[PDB]
Write a protein that binds this ligand. Structure first.
Ligand SMILES: [Mg+2]
Ligand SMILES: [Mg+2]
Ligand SMILES: [Mg+2]
Ligand SMILES: [Mg+2]
Ligand SMILES: [Mg+2]
Ligand SMILES: [Mg+2]
Ligand SMILES: [Mg+2]
Ligand SMILES: [Mg+2]
Ligand SMILES: [Mg+2]
Ligand SMILES: [Mg+2]
Ligand SMILES: [Mg+2]
Ligand SMILES: [Mg+2]
Ligand SMILES: [Mg+2]
Ligand SMILES: [Mg+2]
Lengths: 78, 43, 386, 224, 136
RNA sequence: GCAGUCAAGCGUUCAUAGCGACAUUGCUUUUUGAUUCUUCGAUGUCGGCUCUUCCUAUCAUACCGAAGCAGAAUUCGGUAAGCGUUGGAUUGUUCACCCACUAAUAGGGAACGUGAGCUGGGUUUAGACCGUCGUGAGACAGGUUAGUUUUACCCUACUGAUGAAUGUUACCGCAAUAGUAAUUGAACUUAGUACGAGAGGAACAGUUCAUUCGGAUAAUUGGUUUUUGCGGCUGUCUGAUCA
């Protein structure tokens, strides 16, 4: 089993859900719903749509998980 | 080189209509024609 | 004169008349072939339709292109608690048919069924089976007569059972009583099996195992009055037609001077009895279990219940039969499941299925999340919540 | 022995198989009449692997490879890729390629020492063709055709090519490839020679419709 | 899915009636292909026979080189705009309708095919998958 | 129009496998004549679209018999109307003729089925043009252009839907009678085997898909939007911000 991600926004797509679009230049796009798919036909930029993952990653929206510290070090010596 | 192709296309069996009393041959339009066999029905 | 261009007729003529069926609960017109070599069992079962969801599984059909591949599939979920057994019914055979000789009821009965014997419960003095339960007061002269009666005579033997509607998310409190045939050995052992099971429970896993082909018997979704176009699937007349185009133009020829039964007319659509055969069971899930929708490959502790409930139903806190395809009748509705009538060798009805995954997202509009735990993890902390 | 065979009823074997030195691949949905050609003469020399690539039965046109490496597209699943991890010997190097130009078997056209590829292939992908296989890559086109792989069978000893090709283009390839090339046809005059047949040192399998004048030119130049 | 076709095709949705003009994917002179008939169609009063991805259709060349024009000839459909479900799960659709010109045995007349090709067209016809660049 | 009977000539030898002339005996009312019984206080006068049903004189589909049937491909005949018989270019057309798919593109009937079911291209009022005819008014079943298609609410039939009266009321069944449905094709395998001097070239059993038809259903995909649910935009009105 496999779970692919949405091309426009960034959400995960469970099996048998949303469309797929093979463009004329041999490129593959997956959509979760017709909202993300209609914004693709209307020629919209996903960096400027507030609800997308491409917006919230670029604008530092909800970055408390990423920006917080974490342990990562070692020293064997031999 | 030769003996390769089929060059068929046209069907091997076909139909003609005939007036039995008068002795005339039908055409696809309204023509009835006058040909007592030989060279005309070949054409 | 002749028809010009031949074309096959619109509609099937052995589904007539299309008239509103006689009750929501459909009759089982035919039980399977009795074999007295094998032991006593139940041939059918009662449940309530909950809804549909999606499955993934690995196909195992040698010769196909899709061999050792994954496939999505649609499934229905029929909610199915235990049934309670309260009586027996013995049928003697005559030159005119099967005739019911005697019925015998249990000492005690639940309110759930008493209900079914009234139209105005709340005003009732509730006197049903008050005089019958007094038969059981003495040692058993009048009761054991009527089972010796069924042993002596009687060719077939049905058992009278009812649902526990209360263990279920519906409004009504009045249960569905029914007959169910026994296909065991010796009319004596069938009635002695009934004798024992008066006011006893029967679950679904005893009747139905997994991979079993079953038939579904129900009343179909209703639509009231309907025109000839959608009812019978007939052609629309063109745009220029004065006074109506969702019609049949010629209702009939001059002779016979009478409109025929065979032609299509406007009228009732839906709410018909329908038996639908050869549906494969994919899961007999348990009620008391918090890994109901869990699988071998999935490993998440979850029920089959989707996010925010099944729409217009509820939760499923009970046993159920997850059966492939679709099934006649709408959600909430009483359904009869029945064992197959013949031994289906086929090739297909034999293929043992093992599920990969069951979709448990919201059915109330384009759900993105399987669990509420997976919803909080993806988004993280918000203004409310943690 | 130039063994004649079909797949179900197809003469195009190079669609359904990929024959090299160290290994051999075949499509799944076939009869025992298909495998008698492959299994009999080899016997117990090299591993014959039953498989499918990207859920298709056209592995020859999807794959491309020699003795050291087998290239595949991204569609190959973990079930399909892990089956090749176990089946093949320790010396070979399998790898997924990321490129949106084609299926690899029409593009790539190669053996041990030298390789021929599609002229429009990018620089990011072409290093992985050199690194994994261990072959110096050069971009060429057979007599105008960009799809080299379907109109040119190749090997260490020699190579069969497209029928309508000039004298200069064949002799120019002999400088780079270091072998004697012969332009011919297969399967009763099919110009599609690359997909019609397969070839290696030990064997050269082809379709059942190949005639005796045509089967003489195959087995001579490849040197069996 | 029959005329020298290597395999049995699973049903996929129809989006190319009689009277459609799909594009010419191959490189043998023709520009676009006016479908006139679909090989292996049924019959029903008033229903137009319609092709799909992987079907062999009879066609004329309406726009192209003058040798291919004014003759009915066969042809195979390699792309589709009407979306179809696959058994694996997804609904997918290419950007346009397009096909290649081919003889009644199922062999290619062209040498190369521009753009992508369906996987369901490729399995079915070996000589289409021979000349393909991309597959899906 | 359709069917026997006799069999001329054919079919390299050979009347009767099969083509089959002329005679002689019939059936049909899907042709056209012949007649004038019914209707002139009016039975809507072409074709097409739509839709049911019936006939067999069976094009296909099932099982058979014959062959001047090696195989393949055909031809002739028997039971059988269970089940199907198409998409288009030109013409108002019926009819005709072509292109294409197909398992097959069989023939007919039901007031020459069907206009309070449609359409109105055609015919057949009045306007108008040409040609020939006529001194002229005018004729032409010759060509051409434009020309009102009314009414159901009654009884019956068909479709669905209620319902008094068999001590009351409720629950669970029986089944007389009536209806009834599934249909055809590809591929792989059998096999380049059977058969044949070669060229060519099968079938039963199995596996897999599909065509036409039917009954459901709405996980998903798509369609629909007065959820006037959320968001935007124009002009104007509430002094401006909001609303
Ligand atoms: Mg009108
Ligand atoms: Mg929903
Ligand atoms: Mg029509
Ligand atoms: Mg008179
Ligand atoms: Mg009168
Ligand atoms: Mg009248
Ligand atoms: Mg008969
Ligand atoms: Mg028309
Ligand atoms: Mg009439
Ligand atoms: Mg009438
Ligand atoms: Mg009228
Ligand atoms: Mg006039
Ligand atoms: Mg004059
Ligand atoms: Mg008019």
């Amino acid at each position: 089993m496999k779970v692919e991600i949405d091309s426009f926004s960034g959400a995960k797509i469970y099996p048998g859900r949303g469309t797929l679009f093979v463009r004329g230049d041999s490129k593959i796009f997956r959509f979760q719903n017709s909202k993300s798919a209609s914004l693709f036909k209307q020629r919209k930029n996903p960096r400027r749509i507030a609800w997308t993952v491409l917006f919230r990653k670029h604008h530092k929206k909800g970055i408390t998980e990423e920006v917080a510290k974490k342990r990562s070090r070692k020293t064997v010596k031999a | 080189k030769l003996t390769v192709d089929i060059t068929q296309g046209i069907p091997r069996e076909a139909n003609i209509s005939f007036c039995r009393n008068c002795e005339r041959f039908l055409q696809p339009p309204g023509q009835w024609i006058r040909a007592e066999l030989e060279s005309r029905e070949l054409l | 004169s002749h028809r010009k261009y031949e074309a096959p007729r619109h509609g099937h003529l052995g589904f007539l008349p299309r008239k509103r069926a006689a009750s929501i609960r459909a009759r089982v017109k035919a039980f399977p072939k009795d074999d007295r070599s094998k032991p006593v069992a139940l041939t059918s079962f009662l449940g309530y339709k909950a809804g549909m969801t999606t499955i993934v599984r690995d196909l195992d059909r040698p010769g196909s292109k899709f061999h050792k591949r994954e496939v999505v599939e649609a499934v229905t979920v029929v909610d199915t608690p235990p049934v309670v057994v309260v009586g027996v019914v013995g049928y003697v055979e005559t030159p005119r048919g099967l005739r019911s000789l005697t019925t015998v009821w249990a000492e005690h009965l639940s309110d759930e069924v008493k209900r079914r014997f009234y139209k105005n419960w709340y005003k009732s003095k509730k006197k049903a089976f008050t005089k019958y339960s007094a038969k059981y007061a003495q040692d058993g002269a009048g009761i054991e007569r009527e089972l010796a009666r069924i042993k002596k005579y009687a060719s077939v033997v049905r058992v009278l059972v009812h649902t526990q509607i209360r263990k279920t998310p519906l409004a009504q409190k009045k249960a569905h009583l029914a007959e169910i045939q026994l296909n065991g050995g010796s009319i004596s052992e069938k009635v002695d099996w009934a004798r024992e099971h008066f006011e006893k429970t029967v679950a679904v896993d005893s009747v139905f195992e997994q991979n079993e082909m079953i038939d579904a018997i129900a009343v179909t979704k209703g639509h009231g009055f309907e025109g000839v176009t959608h009812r019978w699937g007939t052609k629309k007349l063109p745009r220029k037609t004065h006074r109506g185009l969702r019609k049949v133009a010629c209702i009939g020829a001059w002779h016979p001077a009478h409109v025929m039964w065979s032609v299509a007319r406007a009228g009732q659509r839906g709410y018909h009895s329908r038996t639908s055969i050869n549906h494969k069971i994919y899961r007999v899930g348990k009620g008391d279990d918090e890994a109901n929708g869990a699988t071998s490959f999935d490993r998440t502790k979850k029920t089959i219940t989707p996010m925010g409930g099944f729409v217009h139903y509820g939760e499923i806190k009970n046993d159920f039969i997850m059966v492939k395809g679709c099934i006649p009748g709408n959600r909430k509705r009483i359904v009869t499941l029945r064992k197959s009538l013949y031994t289906n060798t086929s090739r297909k009805a034999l293929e043992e299925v093992s599920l990969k995954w069951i979709d448990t997202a919201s059915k109330f509009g384009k759900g993105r999340f399987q669990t509420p735990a997976e919803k909080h993890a993806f988004m993280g902390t918000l203004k409310k919540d943690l | 022995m130039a063994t004649r065979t079909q797949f179900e009823n197809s003469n195009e074997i190079g669609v359904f198989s990929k024959l090299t030195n160290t290994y051999c691949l075949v499509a799944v949905g076939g009869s025992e009449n298909f495998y008698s050609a492959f299994e009999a003469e080899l016997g117990d020399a090299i591993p014959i692997v039953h498989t499918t690539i990207a859920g298709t039965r056209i592995i020859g046109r999807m794959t491309a490879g020699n003795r050291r490496g087998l290239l595949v597209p991204t569609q190959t699943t973990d079930q399909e890729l892990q089956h090749l991890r176990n089946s093949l010997p320790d010396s070979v190097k399998i790898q997924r390629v990321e490129e949106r130009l084609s299926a690899l078997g029409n593009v790539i056209c190669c053996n041990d020492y030298v390789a021929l590829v599609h002229p429009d292939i990018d620089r990011e992908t072409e290093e992985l063709i050199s690194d994994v296989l261990g072959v110096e890559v050069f971009r060429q086109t057979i007599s105008g055709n960009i799809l080299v792989g379907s109109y040119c069978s190749l090997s260490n000893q020699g190579g069969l090519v497209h029928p309508q090709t000039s004298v200069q283009d064949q002799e120019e390839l002999s400088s780079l490839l270091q072998v004697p090339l012969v332009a011919g046809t297969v399967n009763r005059g099919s110009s599609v020679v690359g997909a019609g047949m397969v070839v290696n040192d030990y064997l050269a399998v082809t379709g059942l419709d190949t005639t005796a004048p045509e089967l003489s030119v195959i087995e001579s130049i490849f040197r069996l | 899915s029959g005329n020298g076709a290597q395999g049995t095709k699973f049903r996929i949705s129809l989006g190319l009636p009689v009277g459609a003009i799909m594009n010419c994917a191959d490189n043998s002179g023709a520009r676009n292909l006016y479908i006139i008939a679909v090989k292996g169609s049924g019959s029903r009063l008033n229903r137009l026979p319609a092709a799909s991805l992987g079907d062999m259709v009879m066609a004329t060349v309406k726009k192209g080189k003058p040798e291919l024009r004014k003759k009915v000839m066969p042809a195979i459909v390699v792309r589709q705009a009407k979306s179809w479900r696959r058994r694996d799960g997804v609904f997918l659709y290419f950007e346009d309708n397009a096909g290649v010109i081919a003889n009644p045995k199922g062999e290619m007349k062209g040498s190369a095919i521009t753009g992508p090709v369906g996987k369901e067209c490729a399995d079915l016809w070996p000589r289409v998958a021979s000349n393909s660049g991309v597959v899906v």
